[PDB]
From a paper:
We propose that the catalytic mechanism follows a direct displacement SN2‐like reaction, where Asp73 serves as a catalytic base that deprotonates the incoming nucleophile of the acceptor, facilitating direct displacement of the UDP with the inversion of the anomeric configuration of the acceptor without metal ion dependence, while the interactions with side chains of Arg158 and Arg208 stabilize the developing negative charge. In this context, we herein present the structural and biochemical characterization of A075L, a soluble chlorovirus xylosyltransferase easily produced in E. coli and amenable to large‐scale purification.
The crystal structure of A075L in complex with trisaccharide 6 shows a clear density map for the acceptor, including the octyl group. The Rha moiety is located within a deep pocket and establishes hydrogen bonds with His122 and Thr112. The Gal ring engages in four hydrogen bonds with residues Asn202, Ser72, Asp36, and Lys34, and is also somewhat exposed to the solvent. Given its close proximity to the acceptor, Asp73 appears to be the best‐positioned residue to act as a catalytic base, facilitating the deprotonation of Fuc O4. The D‐Rha moiety is deeply inserted in the enzyme pocket, which, in turn, places the C4 hydroxyl group of the L‐Fuc moiety near Asp73. Deprotonation of this hydroxyl group by Asp73 facilitates nucleophilic attack on the donor. This exquisite arrangement highlights the specificity of the enzyme for a minimal acceptor motif. Epitope mapping analysis for the three acceptor substrates revealed that, despite minor differences in intensity, most of the protons of the three model acceptors showed up in all three STD NMR spectra. These results strongly suggest the existence of a groove‐type binding mode, wherein the entire ligand, particularly the Rha and Gal units, are embedded within the enzyme's binding site, rather than interacting with a shallow region. Thus, it appears that the motif present in 4 (α‐D‐Rha‐(1 → 3)‐α‐L‐Fuc), is the minimum acceptor for the enzyme.
Numbering used by the authors: -1 to 26, 29 to 279
Write the structure that this text describes.
């Protein structure tokens, strides 16, 4: 569905969450395994969720046509090549793809899972109803870029951004308030900017990336193989966090605003479809 970012319309159930992919695999030739159980597996081709999300099923990776991994900042890298090499696995949909292999397909981190057991932060920032609400209000641009990052999730890049662009007039620093109201302001604030700093965190993919896109705010991300399959989305990819200027962003805004984008990727259906196609 090639269309311009400004034309992004959203429904309540369109937001991508790794949970939605779990239930779609548990209910409806596709196994969802928390990446942690793939990373710290005791057997080579046998894994399981060990009760996580009430899933005691044993997975025989030698017999699964499609494997889905997520709910984690862990990446898929050479450590999992022996699984990727399995001939019966036709597709590996994963969060944080960190290997140049055509069998591995990235899917968006999306939005936090509100239904995480006994976690208010998840119940707060996992609230897609708020994101949907703000996306319906008039997008009155208050400033160019929006900065609200926890530097301690990936200091190497994040600290560099703050050291450089916090003092810029065309940048707004967002306050840190973990609450239903603090979240709403955080969404309304990011909604009111053309861009938003979306650097990688503990994991390569970040929720800020997709919160920004659902609000039609262009996220700024550093180039990474894990993002090499999202270049058909209105994301501003940068070689480094240096020499970003109001002119450069004003240039990329007009370009990114004039282009057509595969915005259907932002919808859960695109990934339901892709999992059904391969399975
Ligand atoms: C003040 C407390 C800070 C956190 C302390 C714990 C450090 C590890 O926490 C990891 O790094 C953080 C910077 C977050 O990204 C965190 O994310 C989770 O919580 C967010 C609020 C949600 O938004 C996300 O969806 C996701 O549930 C992420 O945890 C996931 O990845 C891990 C591998 O790294 C494990 O697989 C774990 O099981 C997963 O949940
Ligand atoms: Ca566009
Ligand atoms: Ca540069
Ligand atoms: Mg717009
Ligand atoms: Mg790499
Ligand atoms: Mg990662
Ligand atoms: Mg990739
Ligand atoms: Mg045009």
């Amino acid at each position: 569905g090639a269309m311009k970012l400004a034309e992004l319309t959203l429904e309540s159930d369109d937001f991508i969450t790794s949970d939605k992919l779990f239930n779609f695999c548990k209910s409806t030739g596709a196994k969802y395994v928390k990446t942690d159980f793939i990373k710290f597996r005791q057997y080579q081709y046998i894994v399981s969720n060990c009760g996580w999300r009430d899933d005691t099923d044993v997975v025989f990776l030698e017999n699964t046509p499609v494997l889905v991994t997520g709910h984690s900042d862990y990446d898929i890298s050479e450590r999992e090549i022996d699984i990727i090499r399995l001939p019966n696995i036709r597709a590996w949909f994963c969060q944080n793809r960190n290997i140049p292999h055509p069998k591995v397909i990235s899917f968006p981190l999306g939005i936090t899972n509100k239904d995480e057991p006994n976690s208010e932060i998840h119940r707060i920032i996992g609230n897609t109803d708020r994101i949907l609400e703000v996306s319906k209000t008039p997008k009155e641009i208050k400033n160019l870029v929006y900065m609200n990052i926890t530097v301690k999730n990936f200091p190497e890049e994040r600290q560099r951004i703050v050291d450089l662009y916090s003092d810029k007039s065309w940048v707004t620093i967002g306050k840190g308030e973990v609450s239903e109201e603090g979240h709403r302001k955080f969404l309304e604030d990011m909604y009111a900017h053309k861009f938003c700093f979306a650097p990688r965190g503990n994991g390569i993919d970040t929720h800020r990336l997709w919160e920004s896109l659902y609000l039609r705010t262009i996220p700024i991300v550093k180039k990474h193989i894990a993002m090499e399959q999202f270049t058909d989305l209105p994301i501003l990819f940068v070689n480094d966090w240096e020499n970003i200027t109001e002119e450069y962003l004003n240039e990329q805004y007009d370009i990114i605003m004039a282009k057509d984008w595969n915005l259907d990727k932002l919808k859960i259906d695109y990934w339901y479809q892709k999992i059904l196609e391969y399975s």
